Ligand code: HEM
Ligand SMILES: *[C@@H]1O[C@H](CO)[C@@H](O)[C@H](O)[C@H]1NC(C)=O
Ligand SMILES: *[C@@H]1O[C@H](CO)[C@@H](O)[C@H](O)[C@H]1NC(C)=O
Ligand SMILES: *[C@@H]1O[C@H](CO)[C@@H](O)[C@H](O)[C@H]1NC(C)=O
Ligand SMILES: *[C@@H]1O[C@H](CO)[C@@H](O)[C@H](O)[C@H]1NC(C)=O
Ligand SMILES: [Ca+2]
Ligand SMILES: [K+]
Ligand code: NA
């Protein structure tokens with residue numbers, strides 16, 4: 170009995186099936202299978218779930234149960250031994266801007282979101298978790314190892330809740346636990362517009378028939394727009410500075426205010442849509458609000474698609490790009506468009522690219538005022554620094570002129586993320602992304618490094634010397650063997666990220682294959698892919714080939730000087746050019762006449 174008969178929490182629609190627009194939910198994209206790619210279903214399983222007890226208990230849950238005859242090291246112990254470092258000197262990517270980093274997280278937020286088990290919407294179960302570090306039900310807390318400096322400062326654990334899983338009420342049969350993807354698997358600017366119909370509506374401007382997105386009515390950035398405020402309380406964005414009392418933004422994606430450079434990007438995108446909608450009203454003043462909304466949403470979609478595949482992926486994948494994503498050959502409805510559970514871990518390589526500080530720059534790209542450079546940790550759930558301290562332009566110049574942190578085998582994830590992450594529920598700049606990422610791998614039934622190495626047709630090291638040969642790093646392989654005893658057991662997040670980077674890319678071989686395959690499928694199985702004939706006209710497509718991120722900024726800021734290639738490393742003024750020399754989106758080909 171093969172079962173496609175579980176996935177409770179979803180909106181149940183009938184498919185127009187001849188509409189020229191994507192659904193919000195991702196439904197109806199695959200006609201033969203309407204729900205493939207849709208939000209609020211299981212992640213795809215590229216390999217079966219590996220659970221302590223075959224069903225649902227993560228490896229590391231039962232302090233007695235081995236993985237392959239070895240105990241699994243504490244998540245915080247792996248973090249401490251291997252992923253931490255002290256010296257931020259020489260850590261920075263010499264040929265990737267902070268924009269490289271920042272686009273990573275935007276693409277990721279469009280593709281996949283695996284929400285923490287709610288249950289508690291005001292709860293004593295969050296008390297039993299945080300204050301009493303009691304493992305049970307959805308509380309799967311990250312216990313501090315011995316010697317841990319947080320032992321003395323915070324308590325015995327970081328609280329951690331398990332990911333949401335399909336059928337909060339299964340089908341009563343007997344299957345492994347499968348995590349939900351709450352966003353649309355397609356690259357469709359869901360993170361701007363929503364993946365759930367009702368939010369997608371609340372985001373829109375329905376007071377006018379101009380198909381705009383809703384903008385803030387209390388604050389402006391020198392005429393340009395801010396996102397509406399998430400008026401839901403209590404606000405983690407109010408909590409980090411109760412004097413300021415500036416809430417988090419409301420976006421197509423829950424996570425839009427997690428950090429100020431993410432909030433900025435979400436601001437840029439919403440602006441381009443209102444701009445797209447406005448230019449489309451001039452050309453076609455007879456178009457209704459819906460047509461306007463959908464036609465811009467359709468362009469904004471292709472924009473993300475173009476930038477991801479043309480500018481970003483080749484510089485992540487390097488020499489492996491062509492091997493995994495050859496020249497497109499048209500919509501293949503036999504291709505699974507769904508994001509894999511393993512992918513949602515493969516893409517977290519972005520965490521080794523976030524640096525320790527963010528900078529605001531003046532119009533000369535010099536330090537904007539006295540507090541120009543800030544530690545990253547001050548900027549989680551920080552909306553007040555935009556709204557009450559310079560707008561988004563000073564942060565955007567930082568995106569162009571500053572660099573991403575390079576992944577380093579000795580310097581993996583900066584202390585701003587490893588020791589001082591803020592979480593929206595909790596009250597302390599005191600959490601560990603690296604430790605969470607590893608707790609999450611086990612939460613989600615991830616098979617091990619050698620499983621995935623094997624899945625990618627790569628050699629699977631079993632000994633010290635083997636692993637030393639794969640990582641080209643005697644010490645790093647040693648620390649791993651001492652923690653995990655067998656490469657077999659190495660959790661996939663540290664596994665893949667521990668590999669040295671392929672020629673001309675910023676991930677190693679196993680990551681390049683996991684990411685390469687996924688992006689290949691997000692393209693080929695997308696009936697609304699921009700290069701898919703009939704989706705756009707041949708001319709609209711000639712038009713779209715000319716978009717850049719440089720332009721998006723030029724049209725949606727008061728920034729005048731930008732680089733051509735916004736993703737490589739750019740120094741001012743040598744690498745900057747006036748906006749007037751940057752190609753525009755010619756919207757002439759979207760003019761629709763009844764004569
Ligand atoms: C704060 C955080 C960031 C920067 C300051 C940051 C950055 C990235 C980049 C650059 C990514 C990709 C290139 C990326 C991907 C994914 N992240 Fe991550 N990220 C920050 C904070 C978080 C937090 C918090 C989480 C949740 C961790 C948890 O398990 O609860 C997080 C996750 C992810 C993620 C998984 C998405 C999913 O499908 O659930 C990425 C693919 N990031 N981040
Ligand atoms: C930076 O990388 C880009 C990627 O396209 C490449 O073309 C450029 O030559 C590189 N510049 C360097 C290493 O300075
Ligand atoms: C909606 O559009 C109108 C007309 O363009 C504008 O004046 C108004 O402020 C908008 N409302 C919101 C909440 O964006
Ligand atoms: C809070 O915001 C005010 C201005 O609103 C600022 O002067 C002060 O430094 C901020 N406090 C913190 C804790 O960041
Ligand atoms: C489409 O995908 C299927 C299933 O993976 C594959 O076997 C087939 O060759 C593809 N068809 C074409 C014409 O590319
Ligand atoms: Ca999406
Ligand atoms: K998987
Ligand atoms: Na995220």
Ligand SMILES: [Zn+2]
Pocket residue numbers: 390391727
């Ligand atoms: Zn201005």
